[PDB]
């Protein structure tokens, strides 16, 4: 329905300037990288933006524009919008503020903007927003730094928090498939966006930061139906009607930014059947905290097969715990992670595997050895069981994490985080049936 | 007492090795950075270790030894301990495992080790420990990288968690004054450590990762006293119910996650608040509401500002700016705006604590550190002793601002829940000392 926003043919950036102080600049700079479609800048008093000829108006571009990014002064917004409708623009992202967020006067002008859009069948994003992203095709209709590639579709009403989180995720080596700053959310709301995402491929899940929805009703209707295809994690600021309601619709509820992100990242793995989890770790402490976290999430530990318990016993250190949680001694090597993962992934009583590793820097072991063990094991068994990882830590575990993430395994650095993902995985699963 | 552990004049590393695959190798390697005292490598078949003259036995060392690290194979730990005894060593860190964690037989050997120590007047940390650190004097008697410098003393009953947290803090740019892996904790325990740490000056707070104490009675009474001088934050893994209540009565603050433990502990770089009324200043609404929520469920309350202060805020801030309980300067907030607002909030008689929240802007030609500078400049001016906490976002974009704030004693967080935990720890400790 809105594929012209994320997969636009020809896009127009109304207000592109070569001034380092005006948003018009950056926004165009970032679209200087979208090759999947043609982009044209628009500036009233400049026939060259930043290495490319500029058009006086949106109605002069010799080619066709289905996407318009309005990023000029507020007073020119109304007219600008009218120009787009006339050129046959399909979707418009208004970056400019000074409307509904300022009061009734602003809201009225705002309402007038929508009414104009509707006449041309156009749809508006914003206004007073940061824009939209689509990492899949290098599409970054925003004035901030692009987020890394990813399979999570993030939507939030808070532009400031929206950038802070992109900044967060980047450094945390985790991205988004598409980014959406709705701003005042005058037209295209959560609902319509939710339905569009559902049938998309690159959007494995939907993370939302909500301050207040418009159609408290229509929203759930759309959520209850979308959860059947792909999960929705929502973070609600301000302070149960939303909560319980969210629950019944099948949307996962997050209480912190990290919960929203953790839970949403986990859908890079296949869905689980039961909540019987198997913990493998080279460190007791980390295992204890995790199990404890999983136990706060309502999950449980799988009871291994005697044959399983006896196998681990033969190659692991005598003091190693090979029962409920499998504690490999700190001496566990790549081979040890590989076998243990393989053996636990094969145990019919195990639904989910959580691989915990404090990356050792002694005894000749490499920084990626343990991750590699896991990855190889996942490849060999080659079934469809969710594998989640938690490598500590800091710079020491980054290479391990980067390797794991690259091989589709969501790896976390906090006990509470991997647990949240696990929780989110079991919950979603039973929203689909199994 | 217990000082020769963190400020030794002569260290003997028994088991120092040239083989990179052995723990003794990393321990001596790490101690090469320790110059506030001499470090001697003791190895049975080595003339030199890592370029340093080595001794066959700790007895042959001409100089005085007050600290030894035993990192040899299990079957030699006994005799090595006795040698340290004859040599006159004060404290011993036994890195080696194979004792009371392996069973009843290991326990008995363990007890004998302690018995030997008491005979020679020695104290033993461990065995089965990762070691100890004193970052203040570049002392890293461990087989892992040294944590960054800091004023939080961290005691962990889990060595693996200890290492993982050290790596965590390093990247997050937070450090520890001292680090103590107690491993089996046969001799020196939490209580004795808390007694010693109660009087140092570098340790502003004590963070604890507890699996369980031996003398719960001694622990609580020691904690009760120490918690009057400086705070103790415990993360208890797992009995568990009664433990939390016991911590509470002794003035011990409880953390339920690693991040909370760390966030709460390193907040004592600031003064204790005279009340629980906090002022929130921010350049982003979202981060502010989340932070307000987090503080609320934590029991903290938002202060009510004076009209005079509200009026001046309204004079230089944008039109759609919030100047009530939470002060929301707009996204256009510049360093100057942060400076003025912080000064004004810190001067309001109803503000007991100030939380500065800043999403770092990369537009309007502002710098990556001006807002922080503005915070810093204000605190330095009013010069009262109201605690100031910062929450900056984020990722790479906020790194320089954080480094600069931390460099001025302002704890800086990246999470609404983290700054709230810190805010909570400051008020609770004020309670304890009675304020």
TrEMBL record, chain B:
Entry keyword Nucleotide-binding: yes
InterPro entries hit by this protein: AcCoA-synth-alpha (IPR014089), Acyl-CoA_Synth/Transferase (IPR051538), CoA-bd (IPR003781), Ligase_CoA_dom (IPR043938), NAD(P)-bd_dom_sf (IPR036291), Succ_CoA_lig_flav_dom (IPR032875), Succinyl-CoA_synth-like (IPR016102)
Keyword DNA-binding listed: no
GO molecular function, one term: ATP binding
The CoA-binding domain, residue ranges: 5-99
EC number: 6.2.1.13
Keywords: ATP-binding, Ligase, Nucleotide-binding
Catalytic activity, as annotated: acetate + ATP + CoA = acetyl-CoA + ADP + phosphate
Cited SMART domains: CoA_binding
Database matches in NCBIfam families: AcCoA-syn-alpha
Name under which the protein is recorded: acetate--CoA ligase (ADP-forming)
